[PDB]
Design an enzyme around this catalytic site. Structure first.
Site, PDB file in Angstrom:
ATOM      1  N   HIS A  84       0.803  -1.217   0.000  1.00 52.09           N
ATOM      2  CA  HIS A  84       0.000   0.000   0.000  1.00 52.09           C
ATOM      3  C   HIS A  84       0.844   1.279   0.000  1.00 52.09           C
ATOM      4  O   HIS A  84       0.320   2.363  -0.164  1.00 52.09           O
ATOM      5  CB  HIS A  84      -1.098  -0.054   1.058  1.00 52.09           C
ATOM      6  N   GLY A 143       2.085   5.681  10.488  1.00 53.02           N
ATOM      7  CA  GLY A 143       3.499   5.523  10.202  1.00 53.02           C
ATOM      8  C   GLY A 143       4.104   4.186  10.668  1.00 53.02           C
ATOM      9  O   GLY A 143       5.281   3.935  10.401  1.00 53.02           O
ATOM     10  N   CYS A 192       3.171   1.124   9.784  1.00 53.28           N
ATOM     11  CA  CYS A 192       3.055  -0.011   8.902  1.00 53.28           C
ATOM     12  C   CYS A 192       4.459  -0.488   8.519  1.00 53.28           C
ATOM     13  O   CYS A 192       5.384   0.338   8.375  1.00 53.28           O
ATOM     14  CB  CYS A 192       2.261   0.300   7.637  1.00 53.28           C
TER      15      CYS A 192
HETATM   16  C1  LIG Z   1       1.021   2.742   7.878  1.00 56.85           C
HETATM   17  N1  LIG Z   1       2.162   3.289   8.262  1.00 56.85           N
HETATM   18  C2  LIG Z   1      -0.139   3.633   7.940  1.00 56.85           C
HETATM   19  N2  LIG Z   1      -0.249   4.780   8.531  1.00 56.85           N
HETATM   20  C3  LIG Z   1      -1.505   5.124   8.279  1.00 56.85           C
HETATM   21  N3  LIG Z   1      -2.203   4.202   7.661  1.00 56.85           N
HETATM   22  C4  LIG Z   1      -3.616   4.265   7.059  1.00 56.85           C
HETATM   23  C5  LIG Z   1      -3.433   4.797   5.643  1.00 56.85           C
HETATM   24  N4  LIG Z   1      -3.228   6.051   5.371  1.00 56.85           N
HETATM   25  C6  LIG Z   1      -2.884   6.134   4.028  1.00 56.85           C
HETATM   26  C7  LIG Z   1      -2.570   7.230   3.223  1.00 56.85           C
HETATM   27  C8  LIG Z   1      -2.276   6.939   1.890  1.00 56.85           C
HETATM   28 CL1  LIG Z   1      -1.759   8.273   0.907  1.00 56.85          CL
HETATM   29  C9  LIG Z   1      -2.281   5.670   1.334  1.00 56.85           C
HETATM   30  C10 LIG Z   1      -2.545   4.591   2.106  1.00 56.85           C
HETATM   31  C11 LIG Z   1      -2.839   4.873   3.519  1.00 56.85           C
HETATM   32  N5  LIG Z   1      -3.166   4.054   4.535  1.00 56.85           N
HETATM   33  C12 LIG Z   1      -3.177   2.601   4.464  1.00 56.85           C
HETATM   34  C13 LIG Z   1      -4.500   1.885   4.333  1.00 56.85           C
HETATM   35  C14 LIG Z   1      -5.638   2.628   3.988  1.00 56.85           C
HETATM   36  C15 LIG Z   1      -6.863   1.909   3.877  1.00 56.85           C
HETATM   37  C16 LIG Z   1      -6.883   0.518   4.027  1.00 56.85           C
HETATM   38  C17 LIG Z   1      -5.724  -0.210   4.300  1.00 56.85           C
HETATM   39  C18 LIG Z   1      -4.530   0.488   4.471  1.00 56.85           C
HETATM   40  N6  LIG Z   1      -1.311   3.193   7.373  1.00 56.85           N
END
Ligand SMILES: *[C@H](N)c1ncn(Cc2nc3cc(Cl)ccc3n2Cc2ccccc2)n1
Ligand SMILES: *[C@H](N)c1ncn(Cc2nc3cc(Cl)ccc3n2Cc2ccccc2)n1
Ligand SMILES: [Cl-]
Ligand code: NA
Lengths: 304, 306
Positions: free
Chosen positions: B41, B143, B145
């Site tokens: 992702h 942050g 992930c």
């Molecule tokens: C991992 N470090 C993390 N931090 C925040 N999330 C949630 C999130 N926020 C975003 C922003 C963008 Cl630009 C792309 C992807 C993203 N995600 C990941 C996500 C979103 C929806 C479903 C599964 C994962 N992840």
């Protein structure tokens, strides 16, 4: 989201742990530059422990009575001395993994990570608080002495605890790294006991702020109290006094949540007087007191 | 004496954590040999997350759209590929701190240590169980992930979890290191939700054995139970069924304490009925289910306090 008891990453401390043998006793030492620090009781026989004259018992020892092993490598002992209840063994090799570090003595209520070790080998990591009665509720078996507790600040390891012994109730006692005991304990086989303990009030407040940050708000109420009246309640329930310094230290959490400390104190007063009515806070049926205000900020902010 | 949630020493994993940047997103990667593993992702915009086609998003990227930083050093990306829900970035430098390791997909009920990281820098370490509903109850912020979970039995790191996302109840979902999610979750913004969870019965039993090893017997009783009657009761409290495999796994703890497994099951039935009458067990007022039988054997004395 979530809120967990979390230890500091232990790698910088792992690279300092060695095995110290004196005669038939093996325990752990901390190798920093060319000195290994360990509990001075390593030098004692069972009989010596009943009434040790450590000055004399150390005079009877020489460098030759000590074996230090770092992994598979023997470190040669070239000097020895004592500082308080810590033995210092000068070795022929500086630890190349020595981190930036300080020795810091902590106060009751403060938390730290423990790296439990056996035979000089790190086994596990957990988080501990220095109780008001100067014990810690650790998890230690025979051979764990010389395991250390620490905090990290940037790149600096602050070592604050070295494990020495277990008391009859199964809680633990030890020293700072300058060999000064926490609490009225001695490195002698004599009758010793944990004093009656109390609950760390400022930490329970910190954890109620954590609960609010994490969306668990049921205990909030319309009331406020005074610091004086709150302290009467605390004393009744075997809680530590809350000082104005504690109120100030809770300032960042109060600002983040918007809840004044004496507002939160009225919540805690009601919880102590009434119980939790079958409810939990942050998954707990007890009021948790081993998170400091800084612990909560650090975890709700993501400091590395 | 004592009994604490105890993580593995994290140093071998700390030496593998890096920062991965793609566009305006930063998260963590795991650097082993000359490969960096991270959640795929990382390539997505927020809008992309409703209905991403990862094949189409990834084909548009070059190696140089990925930045990897290890401490102060930039590592050059020289290849990429996707395996399930993980991106693998080949870099020009093998990690000199790569430990002995393996990848293991764990079963529900199993525990591991999590090294929470931000910007490639370790923040803290804690224990987690894989819940029956295939979530973990972590502590993760934006942050985080690419943070990983692992065990280190016998000097080899077994990586079993990489963090991907938070679910609406605030629990956490992720993958093994082959990029296959635990549970039915997807790396897509959908209405997916944690199923109702259950208590890990074998672990509660293990922890009651720990309590006996450490000197406490107050909760025992004069009764036994059949395995079937035990399961009929325990499921009414939303406990997982206990299997004969679980009974076998508890055998060493049973042997050390002299308490038959189905006799400890009778104790648990009674605790569920009665509560603790103001007492605690190993410092807890609730029954703990995130210690495995193996975790108890690891931590507790091999000598019961009789
Ligand atoms: C991992 N470090 C993390 N931090 C925040 N999330 C949630 C999130 N926020 C975003 C922003 C963008 Cl630009 C792309 C992807 C993203 N995600 C990941 C996500 C979103 C929806 C479903 C599964 C994962 N992840
Ligand atoms: C530290 N690793 C450790 N392991 C077991 N203990 C308790 C104990 N056992 C002995 C044996 C001998 Cl021969 C000397 C000292 C000793 N100790 C430590 C101790 C400390 C304070 C009071 C009583 C005993 N420690
Ligand atoms: Cl009022
Ligand atoms: Na109030």
């Amino acid at each position: 989201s979530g809120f967990r008891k979390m230890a500091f990453p232990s790698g910088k401390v792992e690279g300092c742990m060695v095995q110290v043998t004196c005669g038939t006793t093996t325990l752990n030492g901390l190798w920093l530059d060319d000195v290994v620090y360990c509990p001075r009781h390593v030098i004692c026989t069972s009989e010596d422990m009943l009434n040790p004259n450590y000055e004399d018992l150390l005079i009877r020892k020489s460098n030759h009575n000590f074996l230090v092993q770092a992994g598979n490598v023997q470190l040669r002992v070239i000097g020895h001395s004592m500082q308080n209840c810590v033995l210092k063994l000068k070795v022929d090799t500086a630890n190349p993994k020595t981190p930036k570090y300080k020795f810091v003595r902590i106060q009751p209520g403060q938390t730290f990570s423990v790296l439990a070790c056996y035979n000089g080998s790190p086994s596990g990591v957990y988080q501990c608080a220095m109780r008001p009665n100067f014990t810690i509720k650790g998890s230690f078996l025979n051979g764990s002495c010389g395991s250390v507790g620490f905090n990290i600040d940037y790149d600096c390891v602050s070592f604050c605890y070295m494990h020495h012994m277990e008391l009859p109730t199964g809680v633990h006692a030890g020293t700072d790294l300058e060999g000064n005991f926490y609490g009225p304990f001695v490195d002698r086989q004599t009758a010793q006991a944990a004093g009656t303990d109390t609950t760390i009030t400022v930490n329970v407040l910190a954890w109620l702020y954590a609960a609010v940050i994490n969306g668990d708000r049921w205990f909030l109420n319309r009331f406020t109290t005074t610091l004086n009246d709150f302290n009467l309640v605390a004393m009744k329930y075997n809680y530590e006094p809350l000082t104005q310094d504690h109120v100030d230290i809770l300032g960042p959490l109060s600002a983040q949540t918007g809840i004044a400390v004496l507002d939160m104190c009225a919540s805690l007063k009601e919880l102590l007087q009434n119980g939790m009515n079958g409810r939990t806070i942050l998954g707990s049926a007890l009021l948790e007191d081993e998170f400091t205000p800084f612990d909560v900020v650090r975890q709700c902010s993501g400091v590395t």
